[PDB]
């Protein structure tokens, strides 16, 4: 797709057998989603940092689908004010900024 | 330009007679810049909100140039961990996400 930016670029993702909404966020290094159950091994990761860090679970090589594009990448699962698709998954779907 | 997302999309902007660096951030509604002096009238704006709000100065209709694109838009001036170009100025330069 071509997504303009007059509104927040919220898209549907498919992951963990669920449909979720998440913000395409070029200001986010990583993808962080709340309330998804992913299988298998994970490792703790500290994110944030201003005022302290938040611990999340890092899952690697997770299959996820974003607007018809099936890709694989790291998903952080943990509390987040809003679900976020970061640059790590945008590179996998071939998402660019253009002007 | 076509900007990939393997690295943070930091661009140079010209504003308030200075060259500054700022992040193209589709997850930010607004543009917030630190240590720029803009002339004329402004009004306070509260931004943020998680744990409390931050007060900044809102300047309207500010001329700013982003990668040689001269546009006009609102600039918030105040403390920010990183300078950010939000969606308000990305729409003015005709920036879209594409995949
Ligand atoms: Na990844
Ligand atoms: Na604006």
Q: Cα B3–A50–A82 angle (5° rounding)?
A: 60
Query: Can you give the length of chain B in residues?
Result: 99
Residues in Cβ contact with B46 at an 8 Å cutoff, skipping those fewer than 6 apart = B53, B54, B55, B56
Ligand 1 centroid to residue B76 C-alpha, Å:
33
Residues in Cβ contact with A96 at an 8 Å cutoff, skipping those fewer than 6 apart = B2, B3, B4, B5, B97, B98, B99
Contacts of A24 in chain B (CB under 8 A): 26-27, 97
Question: For residue B23, what is the nearest residue in chain A, using CA coordinates?
Answer: A27
| Cα–Cα distance measured from residue B77 to residue B62, given in angstroms and rounded to the nearest whole number | 11
For residue B19, what are the CA distances in angstroms to A8, B33, B65?
Answer: 28, 12, 10
Q: Which residues of A touch B (CB under 8 A)?
A: 1-6, 8-9, 23-29, 50-51, 67, 69, 81, 84, 87, 90-91, 93-99
Ligand 1 centroid to residue A73 C-alpha, Å:
3
Helix segments in chain B, DSSP class H: 87-93
Query: Can you give the length of chain A in residues?
Result: 99
Nearest ligand to the C-alpha atom of residue B63: 2
- Give the determination technique: X-ray
| CB atoms inside a 10 Å sphere around CB B93 | 21
| Cα–Cα distance measured from residue A83 to residue A12, given in angstroms and rounded to the nearest whole number | 11
HSE toward the beta carbon, residue B14, CA cutoff 13 A: 7
Return the beta strands (E) in chain B as ranges: 2-3, 10-15, 18-24, 32-33, 43-49, 52-66, 69-77, 84-85, 96-98
Q: Cα A80–A81–A82 angle (5° rounding)?
A: 85
Are B94 and A97 within 8 A, CB to CB?
no
Residues in Cβ contact with A13 at an 8 Å cutoff, skipping those fewer than 6 apart = A19, A20, A21, A22, A33, A64, A65, A66, A83, A85
| Centroid of chain to Cα B28 | 9
The CATH number of the domain covering residues in A1-99: 2.40.70.10
| Cα–Cα distance measured from residue B69 to residue B64, given in angstroms and rounded to the nearest whole number | 8
Burial class (CB in 10 A: 0-12, 13-18, 19+), A52: exposed
Are A74 and A88 within 8 A, CB to CB?
yes
Q: Are B98 and A95 an interchain contact pair (Cβ–Cβ within 8 Å)?
A: yes
For residue B59, what are the CA distances in angstroms to B28, B34, B39, B47, B51?
Answer: 17, 13, 9, 14, 25
Contacts of A5 in chain B (CB under 8 A): 26, 87, 90-91, 95-97
Closest CA to B3 of B70, B80, B66: B66
Q: What are phi and psi of A43, to 5 degrees?
A: -130, 150
Phi and psi based region of residue B81 (left: phi greater than 0; alpha: psi -120 to 50; beta: remaining): alpha
Return the beta strands (E) in chain A as ranges: 2-3, 10-15, 18-24, 32-33, 43-49, 52-66, 69-77, 84-85, 96-98
Structural resolution in Å: 1.3
Q: Which residues of B touch A (CB under 8 A)?
A: 1-6, 8-9, 23-29, 50-51, 67, 69, 81, 84, 87, 90-91, 93-99
């Amino acid at each position: 797709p071509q997504i303009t930016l007059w509104q927040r670029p919220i898209v549907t993702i498919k992951i963990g057998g669920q449909l979720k909404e998440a913000l395409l966020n070029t200001g986010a290094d990583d993808t962080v989603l709340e309330e998804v159950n992913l299988p298998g091994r994970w490792k703790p990761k500290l994110i944030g940092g201003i005022g302290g860090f938040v611990k999340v679970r890092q899952y690697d090589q997770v299959p996820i689908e974003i607007c018809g594009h099936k890709v694989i990448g790291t998903v952080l699962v943990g509390p987040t004010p809003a679900n976020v698709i970061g640059r790590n998954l945008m590179t996998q779907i071939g998402c660019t900024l253009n002007f």
